[PDB]
Amino acid sequence: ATHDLVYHSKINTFVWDVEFDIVLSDSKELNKCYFVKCFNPYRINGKCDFAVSSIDIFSEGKRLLIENEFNFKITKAVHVATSKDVTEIVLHLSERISSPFPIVKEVVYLD
Amino acid sequence: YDYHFEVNGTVVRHKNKGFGYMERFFELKESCDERSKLSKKQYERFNALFNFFEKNGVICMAKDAGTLNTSIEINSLAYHGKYDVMKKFIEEQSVSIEDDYKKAFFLACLGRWEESYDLYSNIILNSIDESNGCVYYLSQINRYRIYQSITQAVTQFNGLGLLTFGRHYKPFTDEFLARIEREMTNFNIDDLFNGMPFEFQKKYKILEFLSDNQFLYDDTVKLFELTNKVRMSSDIVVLLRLYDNLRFLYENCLWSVSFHEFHQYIRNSMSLLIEKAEYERTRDIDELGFSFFGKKSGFFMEYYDFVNISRHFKIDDIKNLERSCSIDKIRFGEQEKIEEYLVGIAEEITKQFSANGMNVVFYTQFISEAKAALYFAKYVKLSEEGLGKIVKALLFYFPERDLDIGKRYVWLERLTKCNELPKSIISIIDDFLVLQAEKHIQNYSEVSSNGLYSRDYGALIKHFEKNFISKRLSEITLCLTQDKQKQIDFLFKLLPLLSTNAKSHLLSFKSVENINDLMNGIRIGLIDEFTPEHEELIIEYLETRKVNYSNDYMSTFGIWYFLEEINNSKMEEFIGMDDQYDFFVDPENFDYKKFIPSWLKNYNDKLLGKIAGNKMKHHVIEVLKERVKNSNDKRYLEILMNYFI
Amino acid sequence: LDNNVVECIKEITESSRNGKLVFFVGAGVSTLSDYPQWWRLVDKYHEELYGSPKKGNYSSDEYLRIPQIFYNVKGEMAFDGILKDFFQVDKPTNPIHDKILAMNPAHVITTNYDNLIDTACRGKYFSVISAEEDVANATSSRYLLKVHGDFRKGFKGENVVLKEDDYLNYDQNYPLISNLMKTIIATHTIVFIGYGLGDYNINMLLNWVRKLQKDSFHKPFFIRTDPSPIENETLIYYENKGLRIIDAASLIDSNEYDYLERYSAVMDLLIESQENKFITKDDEVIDYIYGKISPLFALQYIRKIDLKHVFEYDYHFEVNGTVVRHKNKGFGYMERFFELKESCDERSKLSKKQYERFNALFNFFEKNGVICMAKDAGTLNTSIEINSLAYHGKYDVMKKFIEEQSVSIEDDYKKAFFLACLGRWEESYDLYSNIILNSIDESNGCVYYLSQINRYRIYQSITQAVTQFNGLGLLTFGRHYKPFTDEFLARIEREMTNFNIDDLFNGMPFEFQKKYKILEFLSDNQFLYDDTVKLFELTNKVRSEMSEGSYSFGMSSDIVVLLRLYDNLRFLYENCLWSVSFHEFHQYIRNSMSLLIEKAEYERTRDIDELGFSFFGKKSGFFMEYYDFVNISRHFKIDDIKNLERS
């Protein structure tokens, strides 16, 4: 299950094809969603300078509108290949890295 | 093997142990009195031989070489992709069997594989006698190849297709498939050459390789000469051999030009050529001088190179070629012909989408070429009319299933690097934005892959024109009400484009109350101005966290303060909880032992430049130096070289 | 089905695959297209001659006597006119014609005087022979031999054998056609179709066959399609005469007037059986695999990627040692073989000879590294080892082996290879010529082929040497004179004027071209193709990672390059082939080693593996062993090593 794990050092992230059963803060529960990170250093911007990577959240295949992103309840990790539980590996990899989102599903390089 | 015919048009003697007939032929060609010592029959035969040799570009012997410069010229409508011309030519009644052969090849190139198979069968039936066996043999080969391609299309269209392409989309009927399977139940192509009359085998020996599974191993193996690092050249030899292969395969109307092996060979050849050219340029710069060589790579790129790269390359291969073989220093050649080719591509795309006569078999072949050509057209300077037509075709009539909104924006931004935005292109983009706004009126939402949406088009418009106002969008938002929320959100994403009165009328439909409202509004909408009351709201949030003393909120306000978007002394009262906030607020007193270099991987160009301009500089330089020395990381080295040096 | 029917079908399929199948077509096939039959013309002649017919009195002799009487009495023009009236009609082809042509027959011999078999012959080129002057003027080597005078030249009675007089003087009138038909029957495999067991032509053929010896000729097959099932005594009597009968009535039930699908059942069974490998038990699996593998026992090592050519694209043999099903539709013979290998309890279900054959196959597959199937593969660990003295460069041992007296032909082969490796090209060429001379008596012939190829390569090396020597300008050495005395050079040139390497493989016996199919690539650059392409692709992938700063955490892609490199090196250096001295091979090895070293250096200095993941797994390791040092030494130049050191 770890053979397909990839480390992308240009944005300090991990590519792993897993599903997150995250629980949004204040009792909101989400089913098997995931994340997608895009790396763009030439985007035209205004006052939102503090960004080179844009992170989108995909739930049930549809983009989730962000209102207050404070989910810190982890997730029952499910490897969609053959339905493995990899939650402990995920929680370890997350504490090991100071990045906001340590695990994504696909990274797009717009350089 | 009595002679060697070199690719530049020269002939040398290799194994001829008898009379040098070819030298005597050249001597007859050069002279005129010596030409006249022959009979009438021999004279006309010599004239025909002279015409053939001049047509095939055999110039002279090696000793008498003079002013040897070679230029390729392919005379096939299928190569240049003039689809309408071949469509018209198919309709006209044929005169001979060669016209039928050409019509069959054109039909195959246009995706009408059933008609092409039927025409090949008809040609096979008619032509069996008696000296035109070449046509019969080539027709057999092409018929087998089309059968193979139909089987493979069926294979990757029953599965990995259907709704995943849009509909079950049975390319051909089941009666045709059954007949095809029955007619080729045990066909073997390996014995096809050996069954021909012995005079055909003796004469047309050179066609035997057409009956083999692989026929390009010699050139692929020879491609190793372009990887030598030891200081005509191999570049010219390889390029001329490639042109020769392409011309032979396209002028004789052979269907092997559409298989994976040929595409792979073309890709390998072109990529290796460009790699060798770039490496030679780098070596010359290293030894000779910084600019004595001129820094201009010697690989001149012409119309045919652009056509080959467009046709035979995927997007990922072009991306690799760009990454490893920097192209901006490679200058393109003939630009008018390239512009005409791109305009033809755009017109064909427009015709295919508008007429709704989508040919599912032809679509798969054509769309990859269209995408590659539009991706590679960044380095070509285009006139106003061609650019307008290309932009219109790309934005409006390009199918959504292959180019979502983000990829379309990427293509458009690429097209504007070497050409910039004139008024007409801005008008076209404004029309596209208006159409999208009308489309948003619902159970509708945009889908993108790279994370770029309609806001970026307006951002680019404002980047190229600071004083642009969309009158149609202003009229759209003036009639807007509070019922349709998504339209208000979409117009918010395009806030700066609207007029002042439209802006004031639009503000009535959304206001900010809490810190969530502030962060969300600045995040997606535009609240660039930081009013004191919004600042007070942030101060309330910070006080709440202070007394209460986990995702990211505080570092955002710290960076905003460091960028002087917020000006107040209360920020110094919130030092201690989040180290990044302290670093961005109080740099002089910050304990750099807590600094982690990974923070430098999340800042854009402007923030990094502003950090480089603040003196904090030396500690960051030390951290980056240590990081580069320990682990050879390319991002850290790039940042340090670009901004801190 | 009956055992004898299965055996006949197997023999017919094998002969068709070898291209030695000839179809003898009768008149029932033409009748299936409702073509007019001869008895109707006999009735017309009787009506025109006597006035009224009689159905009861029509014997075999009468069918030939009546037209002769009509021709003698009425004349010649009436005969031709009646033939034109009755035979000028045109009829569509039969599905049986297409089924016959779908079997790929070398020759088609028919006693029909029609054009249906010609018209149905789709896109196939056959030289039609229907007269005497057409035998010498044949254009191709495939004959459509119409024995009894087709109507191509006209509708006269002189161009066809119909009456009794023509039958009587057939041998005198048509010697060439009869001799050609007899030769074709004696050489190829003959399958009769559309003939009654009591037909005149079959009786004449059997009468001719009875004169031959008892070993020389094969037994022709006979497809019999009549409503009644064949009797035992008749079948035995006709099988004693030289025919092997395949009855159609016993293959499918039908009513008495059924003819189209009576033919169709047998024909469709024959067509379908071509792809069907008749295997049901483990013994058949072992026998088939041994038959397809045993010729390769002469060669010491076989590279895995070429095995897909041995098994006609039935299985993907990957470099790591696994096997994958690709295009197999049969009873998964390799899977059953692996199951037999893993469990010793079923090894007792085979006979003694098949058990020994399985043991030999197991040893052969163990030597070449083929381990097991794809999914069952676990922790496969693979080592490298080359057992050639030339690779290690132990020159003194090779010299001692040269001095030592040889006892077989393989020792001579190895001595020739070592002599070539030592620079003694003259002696190596002479010894190769001696090997070709003494290889007349053999059992496989691979040594002869490889020796000829090696001799040609040594010729090229000598010529290019001479060229560079004289061209360079005597700077190295005193006069730069090779041991190539102009007499020797001259002799070599004379002996190698007409040698064509392209037609070397085509001139080999059929058994060689069917068993040693993989060796065909050794005469050109094709054997380096399947690797080179792959290498290029992998390069364009690996560097694509190195630009993005992406660190994989599993099995790298360089393993494929390393394994293919070692397979090629072992195959070339263990079979003693001179192709190891080429420039292309050196460039290939150089590129592979450069890519491996660059990837190893990139992976050496990671960023976050230690900080984190390293608690779970850390497999990053590239150890430079003795073989890597030898390859880098041999196949690299100084400039390439300098570039590698700079990078």
Q: Answer whether C540's CB lies under 8 Å from B323's CB.
A: no
Instruction: Collapse the DSSP code of C107 into the 3-class scheme (helix H, G, I; strand E, B; otherwise coil) and give the result.
Output: strand
Q: Answer whether C279's CB lies under 8 Å from C330's CB.
A: yes
The per-residue b/e assignment along B228-263, b for 16 or more CB within 10 angstroms, e otherwise, is ebeeeebbebbbbbbbebbbebbeebbbebeeebbb
| Helix, strand, coil abundance in chain B, percent, nearest 5 | 65, 0, 35
Among B139, B200, B224, most C C-beta atoms within 10 A, so best to mutate, is B224
The per-residue b/e assignment along B536-545, b for 16 or more CB within 10 angstroms, e otherwise, is ebbbebbeee
Q: Nearest 5 degrees, angle CA C621-CA C625-CA C626?
A: 175
Residues in chain A with CB shorter than 8 Å from the CB of B605 are: 41-42
Dihedral sign for Cα B616, B619, B621, B623, please: negative
How far is it, in rounded angstroms, from Cα B110 to Cα B105? 9
How far is it, in rounded angstroms, from Cα C222 to Cα C5? 11
* SS3 annotation, B82-124: CHHHHHHHHHCCCCCHHHHHHHHHHHHHCCCHHHHHHHHHHHH
- Give the list of residues 6+ apart from residue C187 with CB closer than 8 angstroms, or none: C20
Whether C148 is catalytic: yes
How far is it, in rounded angstroms, from Cα C370 to Cα C320? 8
Q: Answer whether B377's CB lies under 8 Å from B342's CB.
A: yes
How far is it, in rounded angstroms, from Cα C12 to Cα C16? 6
According to DSSP, the β-strands at C21-25 and C107-110 are parallel
Instruction: Choose among C246, C203, C248, C15: nearest CA to C111.
Output: C203
Nearest chain C CA: its distance from A65 CA (Å): 30
Contact A72 B551 (CB under 8 A): yes
Residues in chain C with CB shorter than 8 Å from the CB of B231 are: 639
- Residue window 92-121, chain C: list those with CB within 8 Å of chain B: 98, 102-104
How far is it, in rounded angstroms, from Cα B405 to Cα B411? 10
| Chain B residue closest in CA terms to C123 | B124
Q: Answer whether B104's CB lies under 8 Å from B147's CB.
A: no
Contact B214 C526 (CB under 8 A): yes
Determine the straight-line distance between the first and last CA of chain C, rounded to whole angstroms: 70
- Give the list of residues 6+ apart from residue C355 with CB closer than 8 angstroms, or none: C347
Residue B56, CA distances (Å) to B13, B53, B72, B74 in order: 19, 5, 11, 12
Residues in chain B with CB shorter than 8 Å from the CB of A98 are: 596, 598-599
Sheet holding C372-373, edge to edge: C315-317, C322-325, C372-373
Choose the closest CB to B195 out of C125, C549, C637: C125
| Helix, strand, coil abundance in chain A, percent, nearest 5 | 10, 35, 55
Instruction: Collapse the DSSP code of B500 into the 3-class scheme (helix H, G, I; strand E, B; otherwise coil) and give the result.
Output: helix
DSSP assignment letter at C37: P
- Give the list of residues 6+ apart from residue B530 with CB closer than 8 angstroms, or none: B560, B565, B566
| Chain B residue closest in CA terms to A11 | B601
| Helix, strand, coil abundance in chain C, percent, nearest 5 | 55, 5, 40
Residue B139, CA distances (Å) to B126, B156, B255 in order: 11, 26, 10
Helical pair C260-272 and C3-18, crossing angle rounded to 10 deg: 70
Q: What is the dihedral of CA C310, C312, C316, C320, to 10 degrees?
A: 10
Q: Nearest 5 degrees, angle CA B226-CA B229-CA B235?
A: 25
Residues in chain C with CB shorter than 8 Å from the CB of A7 are: 550-553, 607-609, 613
Q: Answer whether C244's CB lies under 8 Å from C236's CB.
A: no
How far is it, in rounded angstroms, from Cα C249 to Cα C224? 8
According to DSSP, the β-strands at A62-63 and A53-59 are antiparallel
Does C608 touch chain A if contact means CB atoms closer than 8 Å? yes
Does B179 touch chain C if contact means CB atoms closer than 8 Å? no
- How far, rounded to the nearest angstrom, does the alpha carbon of residue B473 sit from its chain's CA centroid? 33
DSSP assignment letter at B331: P
DSSP assignment letter at C1: -
Instruction: Collapse the DSSP code of C295 into the 3-class scheme (helix H, G, I; strand E, B; otherwise coil) and give the result.
Output: helix
Which H or E element spans position C359? Answer: helix C352-367
Residue C532, CA distances (Å) to B268, C307, C580 in order: 11, 18, 16
How far is it, in rounded angstroms, from Cα C62 to Cα A110? 94
Subunit partners of chain A (3 or more CB pairs within 8 A): B, C
Q: What tokens appear for C144 in the block?
A: 């459509």
How far is it, in rounded angstroms, from Cα B546 to Cα B577? 8
- The greatest distance separating any two alpha carbons of chain C, rounded to the nearest whole angstrom, comes to 114
Contact B607 A49 (CB under 8 A): yes
Among B375, B466, B594, B601, most A C-beta atoms within 10 A, so best to mutate, is B601
Residue type, B468: F
How far is it, in rounded angstroms, from Cα B198 to Cα C140? 6
Does C464 touch chain B if contact means CB atoms closer than 8 Å? no
Residue B642, CA distances (Å) to B609, B610, C547 in order: 9, 13, 17
Looking at C46, C97, C107, C148, which residue is catalytic?
Answer: C148
Contact A49 B449 (CB under 8 A): no
DSSP assignment letter at A4: T
DSSP assignment letter at B369: H
Residue C615, CA distances (Å) to A93, B298, B433, C608, C619 in order: 11, 51, 52, 12, 12
How far is it, in rounded angstroms, from Cα B381 to Cα B387? 9
Residue type, B601: K
Q: Answer whether C126's CB lies under 8 Å from C143's CB.
A: yes
- The greatest distance separating any two alpha carbons of chain B, rounded to the nearest whole angstrom, comes to 114
Contact A93 C612 (CB under 8 A): yes
How far is it, in rounded angstroms, from Cα C636 to Cα B229? 11
Q: What tokens appear for B538 in the block?
A: 């942030």
Instruction: Choose among C148, C241, C145, C246: nearest CA to C201.
Output: C148
Helical pair C583-604 and C529-548, crossing angle rounded to 10 deg: 20
How far is it, in rounded angstroms, from Cα B447 to Cα B424? 27
Does B549 touch chain C if contact means CB atoms closer than 8 Å? no
How far is it, in rounded angstroms, from Cα C467 to Cα C446? 32
DSSP bridge partners of C221: C191, C244
Q: Where are the beta strands (DSSP E) in B105-238?
A: none
Does C125 touch chain B if contact means CB atoms closer than 8 Å? yes
Whether C113 is catalytic: yes
DSSP bridge partners of A8: A13, C550
Helical pair C409-421 and C446-472, crossing angle rounded to 10 deg: 20
Residue B273, CA distances (Å) to A99, B225, B226, C148 in order: 42, 10, 7, 66
Count interface pairs A-C at CB distance under 8 A. Answer: 43
Contact B199 C524 (CB under 8 A): no
The burial class, CB within 10 Å (0-12 / 13-18 / 19+), for A74 is middle
How far is it, in rounded angstroms, from Cα C334 to Cα C340? 10
Residues in chain A with CB shorter than 8 Å from the CB of C612 are: 92-93, 96-97
With tokens 């797994």, the residue in question is C617
- How far, rounded to the nearest angstrom, does the alpha carbon of residue C638 sit from its chain's CA centroid? 46
According to DSSP, the β-strands at B10-13 and B60-61 are parallel
Instruction: Choose among C599, B323, C603: nearest CA to A7.
Output: C603
How far is it, in rounded angstroms, from Cα C628 to Cα C622? 11
The conformational region for residue B544 under phi > 0 = left, psi -120 to 50 = alpha, else beta, is: alpha
Dihedral sign for Cα A100, A101, A102, A107, please: negative
DSSP assignment letter at C305: G
Q: Nearest 5 degrees, angle CA A77-CA A79-CA A83?
A: 100
Q: What are phi and psi of B544, to 5 degrees?
A: -60, -45
Q: What tokens appear for A15 in the block?
A: 């590519």
Among A4, A5, A91, most C C-beta atoms within 10 A, so best to mutate, is A5
How far is it, in rounded angstroms, from Cα C608 to Cα A97? 9
Instruction: Choose among C208, C116, C119: nearest CA to C170.
Output: C208
Q: What tokens appear for B166 in the block?
A: 């849009």
Dihedral sign for Cα C555, C557, C562, C565, please: positive
According to DSSP, the β-strands at C143-146 and C107-110 are parallel
Q: Answer whether C110's CB lies under 8 Å from C117's CB.
A: yes
Whether C459 is catalytic: no
How far is it, in rounded angstroms, from Cα A111 to Cα B323? 10
CB atoms within 10 A of CB C99: 17
Residues in chain C with CB shorter than 8 Å from the CB of A5 are: 553-554
With tokens 């650059």, the residue in question is C525
Count interface pairs B-C at CB distance under 8 A. Answer: 85
DSSP bridge partners of B10: B60
Q: What tokens appear for B45 in the block?
A: 């035969």
Nearest chain A CA: its distance from C552 CA (Å): 5
H helical segments located in B508-616: 515-524, 532-548, 554-562, 579-585, 605-612
DSSP bridge partners of C317: C323
How far is it, in rounded angstroms, from Cα B400 to Cα B388? 20
Among B185, B212, B630, most C C-beta atoms within 10 A, so best to mutate, is B185
DSSP assignment letter at B394: I
* Residue positions counted in chain B: 645
- How far, rounded to the nearest angstrom, does the alpha carbon of residue C67 sit from its chain's CA centroid? 50
- The greatest distance separating any two alpha carbons of chain A, rounded to the nearest whole angstrom, comes to 44
How far is it, in rounded angstroms, from Cα C434 to Cα A6? 60
Choose the closest CB to A9 out of B552, B560, B633: B633
Contact B323 C547 (CB under 8 A): yes
According to DSSP, the β-strands at A78-79 and B10-13 are unpaired
How far is it, in rounded angstroms, from Cα B342 to Cα B80? 11
The DSSP line for A8-25 is ETTTTEEE---BB-BEET
Instruction: Choose among C396, C449, C444: nearest CA to C418.
Output: C396
DSSP bridge partners of C189: C21
- Give the list of residues 6+ apart from residue C556 with CB closer than 8 angstroms, or none: C599, C603
Does A28 touch chain C if contact means CB atoms closer than 8 Å? no
Q: What are phi and psi of C21, to 5 degrees?
A: -115, 130
Residue C75, CA distances (Å) to A51, B523, B626, C41, C138 in order: 109, 111, 117, 16, 35
Looking at C45, C71, C113, C448, which residue is catalytic?
Answer: C113
How far is it, in rounded angstroms, from Cα C73 to Cα B586? 133
Determine the straight-line distance between the first and last CA of chain A, rounded to whole angstroms: 30
Q: What tokens appear for C197 in the block?
A: 């067991």
How far is it, in rounded angstroms, from Cα C1 to Cα C8? 11
Q: Answer whether B529's CB lies under 8 Å from B543's CB.
A: no
Among C541, C551, C602, C606, most A C-beta atoms within 10 A, so best to mutate, is C551
Residues in chain A with CB shorter than 8 Å from the CB of C616 are: 2, 89
Contact A7 C616 (CB under 8 A): no
Q: Answer whether A15's CB lies under 8 Å from A77's CB.
A: no
Rg of chain B over all Cα atoms, to the nearest angstrom: 33
Residue C430, CA distances (Å) to C346, C452, C454, C462, C482 in order: 53, 12, 12, 13, 17
Q: What are phi and psi of B10, to 5 degrees?
A: -105, 155
DSSP assignment letter at C190: E
Q: What tokens appear for B324 in the block?
A: 């490893």
DSSP bridge partners of B397: none
Determine the straight-line distance between the first and last CA of chain B, rounded to whole angstroms: 63
Does A9 touch chain C if contact means CB atoms closer than 8 Å? yes
Instruction: Choose among B558, B493, B562: nearest CA to B521.
Output: B493
DSSP assignment letter at C247: E
Residue B532, CA distances (Å) to B352, B535, B568, C448 in order: 56, 5, 10, 96
Instruction: Choose among A4, A64, A68, A66: nearest CA to A34.
Output: A64
Contact A44 B463 (CB under 8 A): yes
Instruction: Collapse the DSSP code of C23 into the 3-class scheme (helix H, G, I; strand E, B; otherwise coil) and give the result.
Output: strand
Contacts 24+ apart (CB under 8 A), B593-596: B595/B619, B595/B623, B596/A98
Does C553 touch chain A if contact means CB atoms closer than 8 Å? yes
How far is it, in rounded angstroms, from Cα B425 to Cα C571? 63
Contact A10 C609 (CB under 8 A): no
Contact B450 A66 (CB under 8 A): no
The DSSP line for C45-58 is HHHHHTSS--SS--
Method underlying the structure: cryo-EM
